Design a binder for this molecule. Structure first.
Ligand SMILES: Nc1ncnc2c1ncn2[C@@H]1O[C@H](COP(=O)(O)OP(=O)(O)OP(O)(O)=S)[C@@H](O)[C@H]1O
Ligand SMILES: Nc1ncnc2c1ncn2[C@@H]1O[C@H](COP(=O)(O)OP(=O)(O)OP(O)(O)=S)[C@@H](O)[C@H]1O
Ligand SMILES: Nc1ncnc2c1ncn2[C@@H]1O[C@H](COP(=O)(O)OP(=O)(O)OP(O)(O)=S)[C@@H](O)[C@H]1O
Ligand SMILES: [Mg+2]
Ligand SMILES: [Mg+2]
Ligand SMILES: [Mg+2]
Lengths: 477, 322, 314, 254, 255
């Protein structure tokens, strides 16, 4: 019907110009799917202008709810292909994969044939696009699924598109080089904001831009979560169901609450209940914005800095308590204590007036970035272990400063003829281009490389790519 | 040949000791016939299992082997157990009998949160046709819902009268001679645990049964049980309090090495002795208790034992200077 | 015999007391019909399962027996189940009013393994036209990220004291039992937000001692009396506190965990002392609690806790 | 002391294959009037009982009653090795610690001698309490087997009900529902295809599907099974025998 | 609404058992003419069409056209219940949320009524138009199933060649190869053993082994299966029925 559908399904994209964010990856996937036929004609050996001609299959990965499935379905439908979809809700064991999909690997569609075959629209209507979605979600009930799908990544005859959430997971190791792996990222705030404004204009109801920015900060970029939360719909809504952590942070940091007249009106039990209001976001919010308030509860002879120091000490104690709690859930009884140490005591110590605005916690984004970079470093070590004899931690600590002087330092001065030397160097360690970018990504400090990598001309980078796509020395087993 | 734990197990209600407060209400429940879901919790070696088995035997007599399901700990603890065995035992009826069936779980506190939720759902489902009686050692490791669904019963440790009556009873049916101080030491060590008493009595029996008539002195009981002697404890405390560092260190090392004692019971006995001293200043007690608790918590994680022993000596000598 | 918690369980959505904005949201949902997939998180015994049950009832009217699939912890929820049965139920044909939908209520969703939760993703995404999932979990952290992204999160706050007091007043009025105000205060103190536990303790008190009075409540709950704990914590001489802990609490066989929890819950309500001293005493009590939970529940730890509390109060 | 000769070999074969799955260990008590046995499943819902007198045998001789506790799995394994033309004989002597089975054909001297080990677990509780039942009926075992293994796929709880001259089996699950109605009738052409029924008061009660599937496995004994249903009492499923019977006591559900 | 009465209880059983291995969910379009039902494979390679005209029904009303979405596993579990001597009866009420299957015995009052919950399937009904197939032959289904079971044990691809009035099946596997040659001939003594052939252009096609093994299971409905092969169109296998037909559309492989 019209009003019975969800907001995520009714407002889902229809073309490729509505998918917000990650335009580069979508364009790369579309170009690869379009030129797949020419690459098949040449036996998958001549990488044409993008190094994406030798890859049989593609792999989509990234955070949850970015548009992976939508983008894949839309780029498959736009070129006139026929979609054969398999997901986690189907038994993708080794025997069942051999039975069902292996037979339909190279065959032609019957629905695609009987659908439209008389008008000269496109010759790829009968061909298959096999979309293996949720490949990371294969449980223990699918034996040999990863290996059989990695084998399917080769010796195939139709565009195979794999979708996962954590590519650098060691379980996904058999997909090392046999598939083109493009990466989806958390879309910029502007695109999500524009999509929200469009949806709100269509639904005929206005919001404050501050509320939109706060929602985008809360959901951490999951567009699906944003739409599903907006569907719940104004001050009462944001103040009681949606943005509750911000209200908790604002109420627990008030100076008038911990005064004697105020404490007798708002006793400790109300503050602990305020913590229990949301026992998953209050400690992080408090740790985020406890040292940005002008106090009014300082003792007669206590400066700001030592009060903040005591608050941080109690914060560390509460973090230890939280680790002890989450180590064993059956210790639920320790939740009240974690209320006082993590949330109530520092706020009490440094309560007062908010200097500026209350910001959402930044620990989640930094933790996700740290996990991603840890997995990237482990993947780099998996390749370079045979020639360094160093630990996965000492590598980043010692080797990479020299690798910068070896890999990119020639490019800034020698120009574009030193490509052979740097390829020779990076081939003594079984290093690839994605590994090169991952290496350059890590350089924090005065040696930041994100500004210089874009400064160099694009012709040099394209020449490097096309020259590297020719020669390869990746075998050591 | 059978262990005294099983041989001297109460077969009826009247053969349990020191639990009158719960026995009267259990008798009221059984003669009224309104037996609800029970939670028997308390320190180990008290009589929970014996009490519930005796109650089941009294209620069902010979058919006890038919309507009583005695389950135990993990035993390949999957959700399949609570989902199939208990569920079919509660849902299916009984043959050639009248009344409600009984399921008794031993040490049901080792269940995870999911298992406890499953069990409380099963209890809520068939609460009209069967009654659950669960045993536990600590009433805090259980979900509050499962605790509320039933009625609790705390089995307080056995006082002197009950354990002495049981010593008399075990002396009736056995040819044994026991010294007046031996029983005093036995009760001081038992802490109110009948199981450990029956464990140590037969061990000392088999130890000194040369003519079947020797007198069980306190030294052999202390050796079989591995508990510190008050004389050695007081001697170590006096040596730490009065003598110098070398002498006190040597005495502590020789006492804890020539007997086979761990620092835990050393600290326990030492603080138990220090509890009743006539201290002048209170900061002494404050520092003593705090530092010895810190030493205990550090010993709990297994450090270098000589360092913690020297720290015990230092704390004792530094707290008793005011 | 019949548990009062089951007999007086709310059946209409308006009878539920406590959270007001979320109950109003659920009322508007049941009045409109367009219900989305929803996770319901919160502390135990605050009305989560009852909420979704009355919601499904008011939504489907005379169709609850045909278009509602409930799976609690006592049922098999593996990979085979979520693949076969849930999918076959989502695809079932059913002629419902233009606003209503089918309902799959999964209780204790945090107990479902990750492998089983992975399979529900496309099942709940593709059939959003005739199936809406409702999860009821205690911890919203054991639910995988995709599920948390799909369905809206609804947190239930812990119950305050006036709401539980009003519910107990309604219960005792409809039950015609004698009571005293300090007994109700003891019930509120012991319940700490658990409406189910509050009703259970009230029924137990009424059935055991007849008159709801603080002494009978503290006798039947089998917990350290808050008065004696307050006297132990607020004593002047440390020797007095140690003697009280020795002869009154430790001798009667109370568990150290119970002693520490009662001290925590009494120090929280000690409105005579200041706020900073209360917070620091709670900090020391929590340190002792964490020490005990690590395997050492020795009397020495409680003695050291009392010593630290006395040194702080001095 | 104990000598029992069978007229054929497949008789004991089907006798043991009747209740192989419901119970593992069983105690045969042999007395001058024949062999009796009773056992219960581990779930304590279904009780199997078997009685066989001195008429189906050929030569039976015993002085005093004796008990032999054995595992049905091993006895079935050793019994499977016998043909259909042999004459199985069981012999036991004083202090019985091993039962001795002998197959032998009169035209072919094939001495098949086998010894087994005996168990010792014994819990008897023999009781027959209600001689009057609210509803009784007798029907061919083939039709009842077809019905029970036809309605077993739809659910796990089969609801039987005896109304006025209308036997009704109901099943309700997730894939649909099933209702089988059968009415009594006496056939003069063949007595083994008749439906006999006697109803004192209407009855209706449920049963587990797996327990019925286990009970029905003893359909190779006879060609007509008798069902006796009565509320607040265990239902009786009896397969007759030339010199005895095998009957299952089942408990209803809620 | 509708009320259909089959002559025998085994007809619908064999019908459902013919294609219960390649299709899981199916739509049944009940019109005044009879029952028509098409379903695509899970891999979207083997389409199944089934037509049962009014002549196969003893009684059939079907006041207005309707659609019944149902599974094949539960239907096969239910249809297995009835014995041989029963009169299967399909019933569906107005706005049907389920379907009733009655089994009535002719000489006794033993009535067995079952219910089945209908599934919801999107009607992606695609139309089939008569194409002039190059090769149009027919052979007894027994020998065809024999050749399929013979060749499928060697490789995973069966190649069919029609050229110069000769049928040629071949398979190239890892353990070896296999080939079978068939010449058309007529037998006046037994018309049920006669390979027809109407050749227009030499055709060469390649199909999977699993799909052929699934198709040959329908050899219990009829005895002579017809085959229509084209150079660029999906092959058509046809089993005729006393009042209808069962058609398998199978798509060839690539070069
Ligand atoms: N770029 C986007 N613009 C607008 N809506 C989007 C966008 N990406 C996702 N959505 C919404 O999210 C819904 C489903 O997103 P999906 O792309 O299917 O999620 P996903 O990328 O597959 O991540 P998983 O599979 O759940 S881990 C769509 O129906 C849209 O409503
Ligand atoms: N009250 C008692 N009266 C007499 N004997 C007792 C008593 N309590 C324990 N015993 C003895 O100790 C043995 C063990 O008793 P149990 O009831 O099994 O212990 P429990 O108190 O139930 O707790 P457990 O078994 O350690 S989990 C019994 O077999 C008796 O021999
Ligand atoms: N707000 C409320 N108003 C009235 N009664 C309530 C309320 N909340 C809980 N109750 C009572 O508590 C009983 C149990 O509540 P449930 O919702 O079943 O507990 P829960 O929310 O599911 O938490 P669990 O199951 O322990 S994790 C209900 O049957 C009611 O009698
Ligand atoms: Mg997806
Ligand atoms: Mg015990
Ligand atoms: Mg619940």
């Amino acid at each position: 019907r019209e009003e019975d559908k969800l907001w995520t399904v009714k407002y889902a994209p229809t073309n490729l110009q509505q998918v917000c964010g990650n335009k580069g990856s979508v364009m790369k996937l579309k170009n690869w799917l379009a030129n797949w036929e020419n690459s098949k004609k040449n036996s998958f050996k001549h990488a044409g202008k993008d190094g994406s001609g030798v890859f049989r299959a593609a792999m989509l990965y990234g955070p949850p709810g970015i548009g992976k499935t939508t983008a894949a379905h839309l780029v498959a439908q736009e070129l006139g292909y026929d979609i054969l979809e398999q997901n986690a809700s189907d038994v993708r064991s080794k025997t069942l994969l051999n039975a069902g999909v292996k037979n339909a690997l190279d065959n032609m569609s019957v629905v695609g044939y009987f659908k439209h075959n008389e008008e000269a629209q496109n010759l790829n209507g009968k061909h298959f696009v096999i979309i293996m979605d949720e490949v990371d979600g294969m449980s223990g009930g699918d034996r040999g699924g990863v290996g059989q799908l990695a084998q399917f990544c080769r010796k195939t005859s139709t565009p195979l598109i794999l979708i996962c959430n954590e590519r650098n997971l060691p379980k996904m190791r058999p997909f090392d080089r046999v598939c083109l792996d493009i990466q989806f990222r958390r879309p910029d705030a502007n695109s999500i904001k524009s999509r929200l404004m469009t949806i709100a204009i269509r639904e005929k109801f206005k919001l404050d831009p501050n509320v939109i920015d706060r929602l985008i900060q809360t959901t951490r970029g999951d567009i699906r979560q944003v739409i599903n939360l907006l569907s719940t719909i104004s001050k009462a809504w944001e103040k009681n169901i949606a943005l509750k952590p911000f209200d908790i942070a604002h109420k627990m940091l008030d100076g008038q609450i911990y005064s004697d007249i105020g404490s007798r009106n708002f006793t400790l039990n109300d503050k602990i209940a305020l913590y229990f209001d949301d026992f998953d976001f209050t400690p992080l919010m408090i740790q985020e914005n406890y040292l940005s308030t002008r106090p009014s509860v300082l003792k007669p002879g206590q400066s700001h800095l030592e009060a903040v120091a005591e608050a941080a000490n109690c914060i560390s104690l509460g973090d230890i308590v939280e680790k002890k709690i989450r180590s064993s859930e059956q210790l639920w009884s320790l939740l009240p204590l974690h209320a006082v140490l993590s949330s109530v005591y520092p706020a009490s110590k440094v309560a007062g007036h908010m200097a500026g605005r209350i910001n959402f916690t930044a620990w989640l984004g930094q933790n996700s970035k740290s996990a991603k970079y840890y997995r990237l470093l482990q993947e780099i070590h998996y390749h370079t272990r045979l020639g360094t004899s160093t630990d996965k931690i000492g590598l980043r600590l010692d080797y990479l400063p020299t690798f910068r002087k070896r890999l990119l330092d020639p490019f800034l001065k020698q120009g574009a003829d030193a490509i052979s030397s740097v390829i020779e160097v990076m081939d003594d360690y079984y290093l690839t281009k994605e590994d090169w970018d991952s290496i350059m990504e890590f350089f924090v400090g005065p040696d930041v490389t994100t500004a210089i990598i874009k400064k160099i001309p694009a012709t040099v980078k394209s020449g490097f790519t096309r020259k590297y796509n020719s020669m390869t020395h990746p075998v050591a087993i | 040949n059978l262990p005294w734990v099983e041989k001297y197990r109460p077969e009826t209600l009247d053969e349990v000791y020191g639990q009158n407060e719960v026995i009267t209400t259990v008798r009221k429940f059984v003669d009224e016939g309104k037996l609800p879901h029970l939670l028997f919790y308390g320190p180990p070696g008290t009589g929970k299992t014996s009490t519930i088995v005796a109650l089941a035997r009294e209620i069902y007599g010979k058919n006890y082997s038919n309507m009583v399901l005695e389950l135990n700990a993990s035993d390949d603890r999957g959700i399949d157990v609570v989902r199939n065995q208990i569920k079919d035992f509660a849902s299916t009826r009984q043959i050639f009998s009248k009344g409600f069936k009984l399921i008794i779980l031993d040490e049901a506190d080792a269940m995870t949160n999911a298992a406890q939720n499953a069990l409380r759902r099963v209890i809520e489902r068939y609460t009209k046709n069967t009654r659950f009686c669960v045993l536990a050692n600590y009433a805090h490791k259980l979900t509050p819902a499962l605790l509320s669904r039933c009625t609790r019963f705390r089995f307080q440790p056995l006082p002197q009268e009950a354990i002495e009556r049981r010593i008399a009873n075990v002396l009736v049916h056995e040819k044994l001679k026991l010294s007046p101080n031996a029983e005093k030491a036995l009760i001081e060590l038992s802490n109110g645990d009948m199981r450990r008493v029956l464990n140590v009595l037969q061990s000392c029996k088999a130890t000194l049964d040369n003519p079947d008539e020797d007198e069980i002195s306190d030294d052999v009981i202390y050796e079989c049980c591995g508990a510190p002697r008050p004389s050695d404890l007081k001697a170590v405390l006096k040596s730490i309090l009065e003598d110098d560092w070398g002498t006190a260190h040597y005495t502590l090392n020789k006492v804890r090495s020539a007997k086979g004692l761990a620092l835990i019971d050393l600290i326990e006995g030492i603080v138990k002795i220090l509890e009743d001293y006539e201290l002048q200043n209170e900061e002494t007690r404050v520092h003593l208790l705090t530092k010895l608790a810190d030493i205990e918590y550090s010993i709990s994680k297994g450090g270098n034992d000589q360092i913690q022993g020297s720290a015990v000596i230092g704390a004792i000598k530094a707290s008793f200077e005011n | 015999q019949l548990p009062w918690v089951e007999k007086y369980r709310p059946q209409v959505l308006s009878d539920i007391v406590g959270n007001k904005e979320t109950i109003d949201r659920l009322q508007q949902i049941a009045k409109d019909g367009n219900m989305p997939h929803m996770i319901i998180s919160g502390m135990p015994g605050i009305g989560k399962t009852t909420s979704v049950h009355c919601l499904a009832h008011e939504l489907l009217g005379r169709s609850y027996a045909d278009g509602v699939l409930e799976l609690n912890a006592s049922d098999d929820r593996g990979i085979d189940v979520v693949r076969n049965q849930i999918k076959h139920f989502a695809q079932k044909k059913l002629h419902l009013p233009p606003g209503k939908h089918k309902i799959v209520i999964l209780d204790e969703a945090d107990s479902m393994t990750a492998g089983a939760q992975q399979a529900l993703r496309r099942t709940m995404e593709l059939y959003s036209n005739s199936t809406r999932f409702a999860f009821a979990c205690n911890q919203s952290n054991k639910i995988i990220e995709p599920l948390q992204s799909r369905c809206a999160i609804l947190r239930y706050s812990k119950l305050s004291d006036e709401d539980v007091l009003k519910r107990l007043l309604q219960i005792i009025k409809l039950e015609d039992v004698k009571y005293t105000n300090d007994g109700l205060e003891a019930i509120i103190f012991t319940a700490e937000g658990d409406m189910r536990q509050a009703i259970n303790n009230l029924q137990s008190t009424v059935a055991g001692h007849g008159l709801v009075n603080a002494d009978n409540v503290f006798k039947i709950v089998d917990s350290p009396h808050p008065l004696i704990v307050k006297k132990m914590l607020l004593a002047s001489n440390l020797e007095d506190s140690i003697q009280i802990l020795r002869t009154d609490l430790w001798k009667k066989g109370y568990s150290s965990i119970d002693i520490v929890t009662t001290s925590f819950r009494v120090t929280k309500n000690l409105a005579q002392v200041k706020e900073s001293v209360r917070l620091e005493m709670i900090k020391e009590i929590g340190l002792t609690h964490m020490r005990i939970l690590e395997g050492v529940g020795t009397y020495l730890q409680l003695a050291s806790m009392l010593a630290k509390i006395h040194k702080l109060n001095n | 002391m104990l000598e029992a000769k069978f007229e054929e070999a497949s008789l004991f074969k089907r006798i043991i294959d009747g209740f192989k799955d419901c119970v593992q260990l069983v105690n045969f008590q042999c007395k001058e009037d024949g062999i009796i046995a009773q056992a219960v499943d581990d779930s304590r819902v279904l009780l199997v009982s078997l009685e066989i007198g001195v008429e189906a045998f050929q030569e039976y001789r015993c002085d005093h009653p004796v008990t032999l506790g054995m595992d049905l799995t091993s006895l079935s394994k050793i019994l499977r090795c016998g043909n259909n033309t042999d004459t199985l004989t069981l012999i036991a002597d004083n202090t019985p610690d091993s039962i001795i089975l002998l197959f032998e054909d009169t035209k072919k001297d094939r001495i098949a001698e086998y010894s087994l080990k005996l168990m010792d677990i014994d819990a008897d509780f023999l009781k027959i309490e209600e001689l009057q039942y609210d509803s009784t009926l007798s029907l061919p075992s083939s039709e009842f087997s077809k019905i029970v293994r036809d309605l077993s796929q739809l659910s796990d709880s089969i609801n039987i009900m005896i109304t006025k001259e209308t036997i009704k089996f109901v099943a309700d699950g997730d894939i649909g529902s099933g209702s089988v109605i059968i009415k009594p009738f006496v056939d003069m052409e063949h007595p083994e295809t008749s439906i006999k029924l006697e109803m004192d008061q209407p009855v209706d009660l449920t049963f587990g599907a797996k327990y019925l599937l286990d009970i029905i496995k003893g359909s190779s004994l006879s060609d007509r099974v008798g069902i006796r249903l009565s509320s607040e009492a265990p239902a009786l499923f009896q397969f007759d025998l030339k010199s005895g019977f095998l009957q299952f006591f089942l408990a209803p559900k809620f």
